[PDB]
């Protein structure tokens, strides 16, 4: 009628927010290598050989690495996978059933382990959006946005303080933590260069370590403190994986205290750092609260090749605000590493519709 | 224009940009068990959406006048202000949810007028 009647659109890039469970996308190497957990291989959905991505132009889209909801499913898939998977001989679950310490005893075979890349695909609809800017502080906007059907080549590693074999930061490092300089939050930084660590004890390089400390110290100064000196301190203290660092070294987990690495004083105004590691047989379980026990290694001196990419560590927290800044190693939460892999995305879905209130008046 | 390639104040060019996109709405032991079930579920969901699309009272695109009166409580649009430009998100989900409420009402009313006239006309 002479009044406004609205139109019906179709095939629109409009969207509606979605809250759901995505699925793993890792090739079914299930049949040939082995199904002994090598990092997604029990029954995981294969990867689309053609990853789709459409860049979004002039879309000032913001992203928070704390409210993803894509993150929510990854740790559930990983815990379920480690359970079906590489098994310790000792399982401990203290529960009040003050509490009753429960125990589950099974076999613990050891195999050569290596993380495999896991893409994350969505069901029909559920558009995923990839932030591709340079200055991304975790809880920040993104000028360069590009939607995707499935995630990129994410190579996650369940690990301690420094993320192993993962993604990279933007041009030096990127301070992506919740708070930048609060003495109450965990610092969430990822590397930009794959720091090769050779473990036989680990022959940690010194020039690359001094360079990563220099790039991070300059970024911390750019984030906080114009004329300030930032010095590094030794370990914070705690469990084995807290003082030392757990990482995939040919399946095993050597434990070198990273206290002989963080003692560099940088100024605003060299063959191998062979740290003492430990043979891993009994450690606290990282899945839940308890302990584990595994099979002895097949090698006395264990060789492995690993590239470490990430920087999550603790801090003193004194004031000591801009006079000097002091940071200590540690951290590497399972909940936070879980958030740290999938940090630039969100899921939205849509049906082909949208309006314009007009006086077009067509029959039906 | 593009798949999210513009940024402006709201209401009309989105009808126009979606008009252009809709004018060119086509863009033109071994091998396999898990992927096929996902394709089947996707086509079942798409076709279920299409039959529900088929039971509607508009059947037209980007310019449609289905029978519910977007009443004066909802109508504030000036005549020439209806078709100018439109991007805007939190505002959009509320706009989009408003789009759907008119949609269900509209198609229910045209289904009601089509059915009402169907019972009453009787068009020899």
């Amino acid at each position: 009628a002479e009044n406004l009647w609205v139109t019906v659109y179709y095939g629109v890039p409009v969207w509606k927010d979605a809250e759901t469970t995505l699925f793993c996308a890792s090739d079914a190497k299930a049949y040939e290598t082995e199904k002994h957990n090598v990092w997604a291989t029990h029954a995981c959905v294969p990867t689309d050989p053609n990853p789709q991505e459409i860049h979004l132009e002039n879309v000032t889209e913001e992203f928070n690495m704390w409210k993803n909801n894509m993150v929510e499913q990854m740790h559930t898939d990983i815990i379920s996978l480690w359970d079906q998977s590489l098994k310790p001989c000792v399982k401990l679950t203290p529960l009040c059933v003050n509490c009753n310490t429960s125990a589950i005893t099974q076999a613990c075979p050891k195999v050569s382990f290596e993380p495999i890349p896991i893409h994350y695909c969505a069901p029909a609809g559920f558009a995923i959006l990839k932030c591709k800017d340079k200055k991304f502080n975790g809880t920040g906007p993104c000028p360069s946005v590009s939607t995707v059907q499935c995630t990129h080549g994410i190579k996650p590693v369940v690990s301690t303080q420094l993320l192993l074999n993962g993604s990279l930061a933007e041009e030096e490092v990127m301070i992506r933590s919740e708070n930048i300089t609060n003495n109450a939050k965990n610092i969430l930084v990822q590397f930009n260069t794959p720091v090769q660590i050779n473990c036989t004890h680990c022959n940690v390089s010194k020039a690359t370590w001094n360079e990563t400390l220099g790039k991070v110290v300059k970024q911390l100064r750019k984030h906080f403190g114009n004329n300030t000196i930032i010095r590094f301190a030794n370990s914070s203290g705690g469990d084995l994986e807290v003082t030392t660092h757990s990482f995939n070294c040919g399946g095993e987990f050597f434990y070198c205290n990273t206290s002989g690495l963080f003692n560099s004083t940088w100024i605003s105004n060299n063959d191998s750092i062979t740290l003492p590691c430990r043979i891993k047989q009994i450690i606290n379980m990282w899945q839940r609260i308890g302990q584990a026990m595994y099979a002895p290694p097949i090698q006395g001196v264990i060789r492995c090749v690993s590239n470490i990419t990430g920087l999550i560590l603790t801090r003193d927290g004194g004031s000591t605000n801009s006079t000097t800044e002091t940071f200590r190693p540690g951290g590497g939460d399972m909940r936070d590493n879980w958030r740290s892999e999938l940090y630039k995305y969100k899921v939205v879905k849509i049906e082909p519709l949208g309006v314009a209130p007009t006086r077009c008046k067509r029959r039906v | 224009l593009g798949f999210l390639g513009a940024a402006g104040s709201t209401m009309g060019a989105a009808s126009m940009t979606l008009t252009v996109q809709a004018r060119n709405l086509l863009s033109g032991t071994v091998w396999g068990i898990k992927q096929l079930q996902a394709r089947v579920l996707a086509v079942e969901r798409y076709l279920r959406d299409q039959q529900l699309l088929g039971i509607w009272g508009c059947s037209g695109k980007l310019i449609c006048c289905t029978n519910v009166p977007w009443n004066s409580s909802w109508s504030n649009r000036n005549l020439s202000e209806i078709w100018d430009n439109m991007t805007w998100l939190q505002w959009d989900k509320e706009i989009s949810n408003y789009t759907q409420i008119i949609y269900g009402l509209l198609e229910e009313s045209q289904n009601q007028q089509e059915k009402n006239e169907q019972d009453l006309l009787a068009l020899d």
Partner: antibody
Amino acid sequence: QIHLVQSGTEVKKPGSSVTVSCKAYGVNTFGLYAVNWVRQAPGQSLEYIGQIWRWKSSASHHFRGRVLISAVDLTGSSPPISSLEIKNLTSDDTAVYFCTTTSTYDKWSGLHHDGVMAFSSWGQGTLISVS
Amino acid sequence: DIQMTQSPSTLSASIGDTVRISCRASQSITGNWVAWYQQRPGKAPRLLIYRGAALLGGVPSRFSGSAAGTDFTLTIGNLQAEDFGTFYCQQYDTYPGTFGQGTKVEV
């Protein structure tokens, strides 16, 4: 669990500039929390001056060229401090200033329209008698 | 702009009543992009119901509304002692946003 604090009491000369603050406890950054500045005639209604969305210094056409907004972003040791610059403080500029911190990351529940967002929380209110 | 005019200015009521508070506006707003700011005596204005009638889990369900074209009658049922205040229907739709006239609820 989130409280907003503005500047204190300020009395400026006729034909001067002002610099009031907006501290935001429990707030991360202006990138996620854009602040819309609104003035208030003493005792009367509140007139929206402008905004600093995505670190954008702007104001309304009634306030353009006289009001620009800077919001010094700090987190952790110091809450996000949203400042306000109003030049040429005449006696008619006697007003009660106001800021508003609301999230910009949440983008599908009901908080904002073309910059003018839902004003969830407010500060104390700064009565400034330009004399 | 769009001059909001909250109707009435003053009204008398007891505790446990249902009174509709109109809000004039030259433009209607689809879905009521007008936030009611209850400025209670001794407290700053606050958010009562985002989106006119949407469900907010921080404010009790005693606050409800209705929209009639140019007017927006917030039908607040079960009035209480804290309900005796000056509400403020503020459109956060147009640029800039404007307040209404204000409605005082008294004995």
